[PDB]
């Protein structure tokens, strides 16, 4: 099974806007380029987020990490047994992604996924944020999370759990209208309360948002002011009912895709219990 | 196997007396109603104790929790293999209990049991006690415990251990007369020393008492005075030989059913050793 | 100023009853005799409590400790400046008390006080309780406390504070009748919330009670049962409003003198604030 | 497999000498009698050591504990599969030992062993030592250890490891003469470095010594002086090479059987490594 | 599988130079001799490094430790199943090495390996360094590590992982020339980030270096000055990218074999993730 | 006032015996020589103990340390005010002692004392013991203590307390005969329970012993065996009543002067209370 989410690649219409957004606002470190993709770092990894020009203005792919070569072969075995098509990344792709091996596939609804192992690290070029942020929480919990929009949650759940090995943490019925709600399913594959959430939202994007977790509450408070100065805030500060992450949301330069910047959630372990919530926030998160 | 005791439902002759008892005396939070049942909270769960009008003046049902949907199906499998009759709760029942799924059955002596998963939580309506209590110890250990009266302890033991997966912690020979004692069996299904105790007591109730655990010794001391002002104390403060819970007992408004309010017991783990005790109290607990 | 209360001497009508009481019930260690006085230990000191035959059935004297020879001379100076009569204990008395020096005086109402330094310790004869008690809290806080009955609290306060250097911690208005209360003044001379309390009670004894503090809550719980078996309990368990000591009271063999056996109070330091309380117990302590 | 050593029974020629030895010298608590056996406690168990009159002047039996009824049946299964004869203790024996069930057998060289579960505890009669000792280290590690004398170490090893489930910790070549040593094998069945050691010593006793572990270094220091006053010291203080227990040895009233009284050893876990030592002491333990 | 690296034996042209090097410079304790081999200690083991005269000027053998006799037989089984030739060490060899049993074999490229259990410890002769070093980090992590030079890394990897049970931690592409690098593979068999690294270096030695880990940073700083006074420094202080060991390198008296003396690395556990690095040092380690 | 004891100088008949004693037995580090004095280290100081040839076979001088130049002038002022003769050490003496300034005087009974400030430290030559000892406890508590023999304790007390600023910790009545004891006075000048003890012993030496404190209990245990192998033990292990130091005594090569090697005492602070003890040992210390 997948151990963690390791990287995200976006294809966007305004690369310079995304560059400024990820560095000056979010605080990531510019890390050069690979082909036509600009690279950004959040820690010791050579890169965590890639941005390339494209009309999609959406997530182009997500990198799903396993711990070793044997693990990758076991994932290939699971894909075969499940009847899910995949192709082994060639040398050129391996060099582009800076990984020792990868399998290329798509989830049931067209999102390209890359399962890999052996990512490149560059401790000789220590991480230096582009904006005031003490650091990000990554490590064994991966880069963060994202909310995957799907037309059929049941179908998506079977794939992510039965094929990829994610596990359901909980469900929140997100109110959409006076008498309409969407049952968002939050999935984990490590200690991070969720790495992927599945939701049947009526937005035309592959994802609703991606999330990064900072080391301190001040990191979040300061980031809010930066994104507010940029005119991008979409929610006030708040704390989630399920993971207890204290965060705020803001627009990325790609319409209808947001970023969530948070701190201090609960983590999960083998004794986790599935529960249901009627609200996304215990407090705050008022839409603006 | 059952992971923890999650809820209790009582059917009583004096609903207002029970309402005052659970709130003003015990300290639970009033949490509205579901049908003809008044609901009470002890933590983030939508409800923990339900009270409905009825001539029983007894425990009407107990909710036994598992961690996920797959776990519930495994319990259904165990019930089938054991020849124990059960029915799947319908949508109406699921909505009434605020759970994602449940199996309805009875123990060998008529106590209705409900095995469920996916309970509702309401962190947006933080718990607020109705009386001075810093909080209750629940979480992975569930709501508390209860002593189940049975006519045949051996038969009850086989069901709770072999079918439901509870495990014997220890036995206390509770003296009843000059030369008569009842071997009470204390069972765990998690870290709580016991969640259910089995005893062949000569009382006409399904249970002898239910127990709630508070966060501090002062919580217990203060609760004693509240219940004493209500004229309900049945024991002085004391500490148990087996779980080392420091508690007192008091009458509920239903004749012959007591409540135990305690603090600071030992917890169990895989290295627990079965032992036998000749007394229920290491000190205190004098009957009054 | 006085550093701590170090010893107590009682003159009683039933020495054997007191012997059994202090050892089998309270848990002190029998430590031989000095003249016609039986000696009892609570720690490394050669003795802490002395019991001698006498019709008083009361506290005969209290030993007030200072840290060195120079300190004792300074106390002699304070007594002289205050016009309080005193005599230096002779060699025989010094040997009897096992101290390097002492001043003999009385408080304004006839209670003999002995200010001393250099007490004897016997670490080669380690303390062994006569009943199950993990140990007592003494050290820099001394042996415990006692409530001194006085006819004139103002006069007593001036002596204990201005002459001996005790400091007021707080006051409790102890209800005596429907519209009658006694303002008990609690005084400290170290970290122990109080070492001496002053109160105008209508009892014919020099003191209302003496108090010993044990290391654990179980120590207290077990002691309660022992004293209850002896038929001596005067209060249920409870916790004080001012020092937060969790204790119970019981009769000593001397009529109208009680013992208090407690655990876990707050301690004081230079930042202590004088306050007033309307009750002696935050919870419990019901009279029996 | 055996979880821990729970009790020892001795048959001796001088019961009063053993009584004084275990209480006044070692510090155990006298705990009445069961038949012609005097009982002694070291903790919450109803008894840990039994002494009965007999010409053996040796260990009469050792109680080997398992955690539950199912565990005991599994041990019966292992004995059957191994061809080791055993008899189930009858009701009278169960009542005598204060256990819920037991299997009676002998090791390959005649030492009676009793495998049991469900021992009686008496927390309402808290442990009170007969001599100054803060307490003993028992719990999951059992009462202590003993060195079993055997004529054939290989044969003894196969039985204790293959049948009873003990595991080798290490070996010490104990020098007997100028060019003669005995390879003592130290075996564990829990965190205690060893519960039983096997050695081909030329003494006519079933065991060389039994060992008790106290809570503090002072406990050991004080016990040394007590046993020295009794004229029983056989070694000066010292510390073992293998378990790092700091102890001393002394004669019991039974010729050639010693007691070891120690503190502060290392404990073992799954990552333990078998090693060999050429000396029993890292320092001290000079024979006297 | 192998649990840890326990000992190293060198065959050298200048025994006196090696003796001075290991004692006065590195700080090991001289521990006598066994045959024509001089012995050196780093902890409680009778020996850790052996030096004997020989033209090789290289590592003569490496001792690979397992936890018990059964483990050794399992390793013999693995060797048989893998078709790897081995011989059981005879009594003379066992006595020479001070072990309870061993298997003698070679890795695919001629390095003699000895798999053993039951090493001798001498706690009665406590370790005393020959130079100022607070101590070495050994224990469950073994003596240290070494970099094994191999002509075929793939072949070496299959043997060390598939046969001996080592596990890949990570890979570093060590730059050799302007457009030439060697993929060094770092392998663990316990918490030590690596115990053996495999690299296709163009040096004529079996190993590139061996490494010892000291308790403090000062240990390393002081050792640097000692080796610098001896004219042996080959690198400045630095910290590795993969294990985060802070160290320096120096020449041993055998040409082209170095020693690494370090402190403070990260350790590994079951959740370790394979990664790739482009540099050996996060900082420092400049060649001199 | 004196801050701590910093150094000791001995004049002895057998320098080689003392050299072996201090290094191979006690564990001090040989530190060259200054004139005809051999120097020994216990920590970062250039020297702590000096040994020179002389018929005295006794302590020749003791170095008493203050924190700065101003402090030394204040001590000169106190000596003048007290009428105690002293001479300022000249440049040659300052260079010999490796100090920035010193005052030379004698105590009332002829022991030369040197009050100094600014001692030399040599961190570039880190301490390396000559025998297995993890280290000594020095720092702000100085090198250790010594027992000063005096003919008139009262006179000695006035000088050490009134002139030098030492403070009485406690008194022990050391039994000399059936009805004879000597009141030993233990004095502190920092956290070390005592730095100098005064006693009217009938020995012809300036001191009874000097004491060094090691970091661990094993340090003490190992040192005992070393001194026992040398045939120098004068007491078994034991623990003192007053400072709770766990130690043993041994003869130095100078007749009637002993060394005490200990661990783990209590320390003193401003809240220390003067007490009296009837024994030097709580346990152990039997004379041999
Ligand atoms: O991390 C999270 C935890 C809980 C809910 C959301 C969420 C809120 C609104 C829309 C979609 C998801 C979330 O992002
Ligand atoms: O929690 C508990 C632990 C031990 C005994 C009891 C008990 C006491 C009297 C009657 C029934 C049970 C109990 O409630
Ligand atoms: O320690 C104490 C703290 C507060 C009140 C009392 C007290 C209660 C009743 C009568 C007299 C004193 C006391 O003893
Ligand atoms: O606990 C122990 C640990 C190591 C050795 C012994 C031992 C010493 C002498 C004779 C027999 C055993 C021991 O008792
Ligand atoms: O411990 C280590 C960790 C990482 C790299 C090296 C290394 C550096 C240069 C040449 C060979 C190995 C190493 O020794
Ligand atoms: O450190 C110490 C603490 C207490 C007593 C002594 C002592 C014992 C015998 C003779 C002289 C002194 C001592 O050395
Ligand atoms: Fe989110
Ligand atoms: Fe209960
Ligand atoms: Fe009181
Ligand atoms: Fe032993
Ligand atoms: Fe290395
Ligand atoms: Fe001393």
From Swiss-Prot, chains A, B, C, D, E, F:
PROSITE patterns, per database record: EXTRADIOL_DIOXYGENAS, VOC
SUPFAM superfamilies: Glyoxalase/Bleomycin resistance protein/Dihydroxybiphenyl dioxygenase (SSF54593)
Pathway(s) per entry: Xenobiotic degradation; biphenyl degradation; 2-hydroxy-2,4-pentadienoate and benzoate from biphenyl: step 3/4
EC number: 1.13.11.39
InterPro entries tied to this protein: DiOHbiphenyl_dOase, Glyas_Bleomycin-R_OHBP_Dase, Glyas_Fos-R_dOase_dom, VOC, Xdiol_ring_cleave_dOase_1/2
Lineage top rank: taxon: Bacteria
The keyword Isomerase is annotated on this UniProt entry: no
GO molecular function, one term: ferrous iron binding
GO biological process terms, semicolon-separated: xenobiotic catabolic process
Reactions this protein catalyses: biphenyl-2,3-diol + O2 = 2-hydroxy-6-oxo-6-phenylhexa-2,4-dienoate + H(+)
Domain VOC intervals: 4-118, 142-264
Gene3D superfamilies: 2,3-Dihydroxybiphenyl 1,2-Dioxygenase, domain 1
UniProt cofactor(s): Fe(2+)
Keywords of the record: Aromatic hydrocarbons catabolism, Dioxygenase, Iron, Metal-binding, Oxidoreductase, Repeat
Primary enzyme class: oxidoreductase
Residues the entry annotates as binding Fe cation: 145, 209, 260
Keyword Protein biosynthesis included in the entry's annotation: no
Assembly behavior: Homooctamer.
Family label: Belongs to the extradiol ring-cleavage dioxygenase family.
NCBIfam families for this protein: 23dbph12diox
Protein name: Biphenyl-2,3-diol 1,2-dioxygenase
Source organism (scientific name): Pseudomonas sp. (strain KKS102)
């Amino acid at each position: 099974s997948i151990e963690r989410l390791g990287y995200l690649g976006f294809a966007v219409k305004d690369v310079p806007a995304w560059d400024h957004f990820l560095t000056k606002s979010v605080g990531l470190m510019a890390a050069g380029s690979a082909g036509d993709a600009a690279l950004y770092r959040a820690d010791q990894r050579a890169w965590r987020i890639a941005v390339q020009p494209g009309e999609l203005d959406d997530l182009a792919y997500a990198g799903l990490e396993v711990d070793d070569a044997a693990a990758l072969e076991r994932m290939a075995d699971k894909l075969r047994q499940a009847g899910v098509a995949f192709t082994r990344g060639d040398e050129a792709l391996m060099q582009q992604r800076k990984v020792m091996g990868l399998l290329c596939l798509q989830d049931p609804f067209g999102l390209p996924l890359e399962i890999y192992y052996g990512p490149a690290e560059i401790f000789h070029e220590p991480f230096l944020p582009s904006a005031p942020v003490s650091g990000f929480v990554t490590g064994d919990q991966g880069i963060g999370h994202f909310v995957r929009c799907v037309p059929d949650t049941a179908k998506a759940m079977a794939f992510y759990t039965e094929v990829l090995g994610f596990v359901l943490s909980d469900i929140i019925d997100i109110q959409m209208g006076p008498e309409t709600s969407v049952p968002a399913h939050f999935l984990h594959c490590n200690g991070r309360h969720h790495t992927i959430a599945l939701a049947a939202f009526p937005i035309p994007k592959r994802i609703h948002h991606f999330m990064l977790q900072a080391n301190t509450i001040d990191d979040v408070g300061y980031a809010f002011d930066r994104l507010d100065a940029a005119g991008r805030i979409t929610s006030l500060l708040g704390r989630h009912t399920n993971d207890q992450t204290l965060s705020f949301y803001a627009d990325t330069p790609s319409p209808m895709i947001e970023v969530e910047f948070g701190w201090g959630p609960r983590t999960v372990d083998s004794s986790w219990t599935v529960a249901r919530h009627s609200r996304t926030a215990m407090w705050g998160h008022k839409s603006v």
